[PDB]
Design a protein around this nucleic acid. Structure first.
Ligand SMILES: [K+]
Ligand SMILES: [K+]
Ligand SMILES: [K+]
Ligand SMILES: [K+]
Ligand SMILES: [Mg+2]
Ligand SMILES: [Mg+2]
Ligand SMILES: [Mg+2]
Ligand SMILES: [Mg+2]
Ligand SMILES: [Mg+2]
Ligand SMILES: [Mg+2]
Lengths: 151, 92, 131, 101, 53, 300, 35, 59
RNA sequence: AUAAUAGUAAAGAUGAAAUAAAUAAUUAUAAGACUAAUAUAUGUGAAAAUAUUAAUUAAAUAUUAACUGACAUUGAG
């Protein structure tokens, strides 16, 4: 009956492509009065709690730390960008609830992010991380890719 | 109602994808190593790379034929090495 | 021809989970018996969680009541049943697979045949001679 | 230290006969090398004589032959005959299309 | 060897109706109808019982 | 003729065996026939096989599967160690006893139908003892038998109406009994599994008859003391007894009251020390294993 | 047993003996023996 | 003719076991031609050709 | 692709580059094309071809029994 938005967990998503690394920190917000609403079916309640809304808090790329052009897709650019994210999560008091890490692709920044989170740079965030997962998107047939490059 | 509140835990994990690991708070680097093993046992990195550029069906078939032969050839090679080792052990 | 229908009905009311399934089985059963068909068996499979969240008629679902219906009808009637199931909002997913009767006239449901019971007589004779 | 890793010690079952070699490291290595899932046949429905296509509505049994992501296992891993592998793959694909797997 | 009574006739008529619906040519595959036609044609042309060649 | 001689040759005497020479499962009894060569023949690599065994082999005992193979080698393992297990059992002088008090299998006893009152239990064991049978060869036991049993219908349609007509007109509770007996009575003449491959008694491990006492210079021996080794430092999980390694056999050791303190001290190296045990009894299970029970005699 | 069976689900033996005057020519035979 | 073999054979076996002789039987004695209603008349109404074949094959 | 949402200032590309309230993230909607593992094109098909599911129609295997009695092979046009 009253909006009671509360954070349930945080999602640390990393997209590691060939030319850049994108790191997004989000909050899974849950209106704790949703079940108190009128005209709400058992299915709508279960469907609302199975995919809770998300709000973006921190969005970073390798170009936000001053890496330009070809340097954006390198191991060092990702390692420093991961550090800046782990710092901004502590400077915003967003290290109270559990964090779920979602990795998307297999570029050069995937192993830098993992190294920065299992090392000194991520000794605070790692303590809250509860689940790691992979979200690489594959196609079963799907659209035709571009032709092979003759180099 | 509460019926839709107390039955969300299993429901949440009932629609799993199989690409998730529960982190070991003690050794968090062992959980990332487990996740990497899943990726390699489902050929996720290889499939992603193979989907970047289109390959003609004839070329795809040739590559599949050659790979199978090399896999089978290696199994035959290992079978012969085991015989050699067994023969050596018995003094042949 | 013998056919095996597997339908995933929607569970709208948590209080009456097996309500739309009963209403649907009666609708399908009536079509079969009113068009020279025979209903051999109706095996409920219970409420199960769907492998994923599925959609139907601009609605989403996370669970469904599974049920099997082994029936004998003509090909034309079988297509009519499938058409009605593909249109009913209650049905989330429906499949009709033919059960070959070339070698024997009495075949049990795949579920039962998977457990070693090949004919309905074997199932009935295990409920009378031993029950 | 009064402790040894399980991988470095062999536990001789009860009622079995043993030789002095059974206490050596060679036995440990030999048991690893020749460690195959041969007891699967007796626990493998699809290696018993049943038709895998009768399990298309039983996802729990079919989920034993797919990886964590649902990828059908190669015959080299399942150890099934050509016919059963062919039938099992059809069962899984049909199960996926029905909305059960 | 006797000394559940007998089944109602309506029940025995329904068992017959189920058997005749399951065995109806109008509910079977077209191949079964063709098999019957082949037998009918063979008997109208055969030189003797068992002549199929 | 040459064929007659070959059938009686020493190589023919060895029964065909293709069981893995390298087996890593549970071993309960010998699987291969030990072959022995004399020292003179060993000096000339002669074992009575098809080909000379490599000179590297210094043992005089081996086990083999194939005389020759496509790899142009003999398939053999230079070991004969199951004989020492049998001889060590003989030295422990513990006769094998039946825990069920069954008749001695090595004596031709006059048995009666006391256990034959389970005719329906074992007559159907032929079709129900199919734990590891093919899905269609086991199904050939349904039509092949049905025709054989269906050929005795006329015989049982007359005997039953001539010996027990009342049951045919009253109840089938006794008719089923007359059926089980009929087939068995008409099957004892037949030969279904006339040869039984089950292990007979000890299987040859011991031919010692219980009852004899061991005379010694220090008087009659009342308790057999045998050196052994404790394998685990913690009792078998779910069992109240530890495991010992006595004379090539793994036994269940029962302690008087407490476990000696060397256990905790030694830990996982407990097997490195030798203890004295007393062999209480020895039994034989149907799998062909020996159930040896011991007692950790501790200096007191 | 065939025709003289006690199974609820019998075989064609029973129906054959009926139409062949066997289940009746044996019922009378048994009854005559009882006499 | 709504009359069915099973029903007709259930009247020739009840009338023959109860003594009733409704005119239906006379009609049934015309539907089938079975003038006499005995236990050995229903057995000759339900004879199957297969039975004859089995004896010709033995000869 | 579009819309919403918060969240930002770069993103995308390449050997390196440059041309043309975003990118990324979470939702919702629409469209067309394609068919991951299994998988060996094994197999099937006259060849060309054929591997997401179901159904309908057609064709396709081995042995046995009976039957026809050379009715076959190849094949310009
Ligand atoms: K092919
Ligand atoms: K001729
Ligand atoms: K010609
Ligand atoms: K031509
Ligand atoms: Mg680069
Ligand atoms: Mg282009
Ligand atoms: Mg976007
Ligand atoms: Mg594919
Ligand atoms: Mg080929
Ligand atoms: Mg031609």
């Amino acid at each position: 009956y009253k909006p009671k938005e509360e954070v349930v967990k945080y999602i640390l998503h990393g997209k590691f492509t060939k030319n850049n690394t994108h790191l997004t920190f989000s909050s899974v917000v849950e209106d704790k009065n949703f079940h108190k609403n009128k005209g709400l079916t058992y299915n709508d309640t279960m469907l609302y709690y199975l995919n809770l809304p998300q709000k973006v808090k921190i969005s970073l790329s390798t170009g936000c730390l001053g890496f330009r052009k070809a340097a954006r897709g390198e191991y060092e650019a990702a390692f420093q960008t991961s550090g800046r994210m782990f710092e901004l999560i502590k400077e915003k008091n967003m290290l109270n609830k559990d964090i779920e890490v979602v990795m998307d692709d297999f570029g050069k920044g995937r192993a830098a992010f993992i190294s920065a989170l299992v090392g000194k740079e991520g000794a605070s965030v790692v303590k809250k991380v509860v689940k790691i997962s992979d979200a690489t998107k594959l196609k079963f047939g799907g659209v035709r890719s571009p032709k092979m490059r003759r180099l | 109602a509460e019926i839709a509140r107390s039955s969300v835990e299993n429901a949440q994990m009932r629609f799993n994808s199989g690409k998730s690991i529960i982190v070991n708070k003690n050794n968090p680097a062992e959980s990332f190593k487990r996740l990497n093993r899943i990726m390699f046992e489902n050929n996720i990195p290889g499939d992603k790379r193979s989907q970047r550029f289109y390959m003609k069906p004839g070329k795809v078939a040739e590559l599949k034929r050659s790979q199978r032969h090399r896999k089978e050839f290696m199994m035959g090679f290992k079978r012969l090495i085991e015989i050699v080792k067994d023969a050596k052990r018995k003094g042949y | 021809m013998l056919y095996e229908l597997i339908g995933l009905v929607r569970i709208t009311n948590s209080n009456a989970p097996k309500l739309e399934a009963k209403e649907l089985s009666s609708t399908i059963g009536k079509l079969i018996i009113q068009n020279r068909g025979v209903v051999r068996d109706i095996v409920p499979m219970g409420i199960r969680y769907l492998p994923k969240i599925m959609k139907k008629d601009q609605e989403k679902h996370f669970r469904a009541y599974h049920f099997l219906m082994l029936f004998d009808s003509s090909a034309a009637v079988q297509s009519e049943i499938l058409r009605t199931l593909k249109k009913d909002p209650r049905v989330i997913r429906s499949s009709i697979v033919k059960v070959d009767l070339d070698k024997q006239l009495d075949r049990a449901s795949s579920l039962h045949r998977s457990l070693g019971k090949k004919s309905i007589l074997e199932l009935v004779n295990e409920d009378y001679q031993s029950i | 230290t009064k402790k040894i890793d399980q991988s470095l010690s062999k536990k001789l079952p009860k009622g079995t006969i043993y030789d002095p070699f059974d206490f050596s490291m060679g036995r440990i290595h030999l048991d690893r090398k020749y460690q195959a899932n041969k007891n699967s046949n007796r626990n493998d429905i699809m290696k018993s004589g049943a038709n895998p296509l009768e399990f298309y509505a039983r996802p729990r049994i079919l989920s034993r032959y797919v990886t964590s992501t649902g990828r059908i296992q190669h015959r080299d891993i399942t150890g099934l005959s050509a016919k059963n592998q062919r039938r099992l793959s059809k069962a899984i694909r049909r199960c996926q299309a029905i909305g059960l797997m | 060897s006797g000394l559940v009574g007998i089944e109602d006739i309506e029940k025995l008529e329904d068992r017959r109706e189920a058997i005749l619906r399951i065995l109806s040519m109008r509910n079977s595959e077209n191949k079964n109808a063709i098999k019957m036609a082949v037998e009918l044609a063979r008997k109208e042309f055969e030189r003797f019982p068992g002549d199929t060649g | 003729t040459l064929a007659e001689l070959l059938g009686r040759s020493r190589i023919a005497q060895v029964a065909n065996n293709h069981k893995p020479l390298t087996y890593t499962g549970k071993k309960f009894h010998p699987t291969h026939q030990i072959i022995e060569t004399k020292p003179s023949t060993l000096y000339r690599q002669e074992w009575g096989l098809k080909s000379a065994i490599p000179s590297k082999i210094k043992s005089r005992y081996l086990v083999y599967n194939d005389l020759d193979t496509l790899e142009r080698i003999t398939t053999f393992e230079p070991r004969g160690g199951t004989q020492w297990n049998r001889l060590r059992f003989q030295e422990m002088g513990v006769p094998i006893v039946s825990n069920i008090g069954r008749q001695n299998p090595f004596f031709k006893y006059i048995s009666r139908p006391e256990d034959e009152s389970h005719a329906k239990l074992s007559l159907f064991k032929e079709m129900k003892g199919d734990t590891d049978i093919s899905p269609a060869a086991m199904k050939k036991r349904l039509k092949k038998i049905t025709a054989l049993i269906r050929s005795f219908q006329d015989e049982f349609k007359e005997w039953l109406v001539e010996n027990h007509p009342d049951e045919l007109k009253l109840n089938s509770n006794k008719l089923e009994d007359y059926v089980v007996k009929f087939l068995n009575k008409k099957l004892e003449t037949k030969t279904n599994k006339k040869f039984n491959t089950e292990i007979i008694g000890t299987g040859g491990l011991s031919y010692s008859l219980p009852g004899k006492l061991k005379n010694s210079p220090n008087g009659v021996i009342q308790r057999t003391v045998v050196p052994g080794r404790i394998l685990n430092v913690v009792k078998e999980n779910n069992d109240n007894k530890w495991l010992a390694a006595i004379g090539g056999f793994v036994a269940d050791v029962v302690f008087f009251q407490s476990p000696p303190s060397s256990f905790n001290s030694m830990g996982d190296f407990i097997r490195m020390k030798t203890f004295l045990f007393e062999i209480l009894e020895a039994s034989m299970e149907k799998n062909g294993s020996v159930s040896m029970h011991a007692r950790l005699l501790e200096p007191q | 047993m065939g025709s003289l069976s006690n199974e609820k689900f019998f075989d064609i033996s029973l129906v054959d003996s009926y139409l062949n005057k066997d289940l009746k020519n044996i019922s009378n035979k048994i009854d005559s023996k009882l006499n | 003719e709504k009359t069915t073999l099973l029903r007709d054979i259930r009247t020739i076996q009840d009338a023959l076991s109860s003594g009733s002789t409704p005119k239906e039987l006379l009609e049934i004695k015309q539907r089938y031609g079975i003038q006499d209603f005995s236990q050995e008349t229903v057995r000759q109404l339900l004879q199957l050709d297969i039975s004859g074949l089995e004896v010709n094959l033995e000869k």
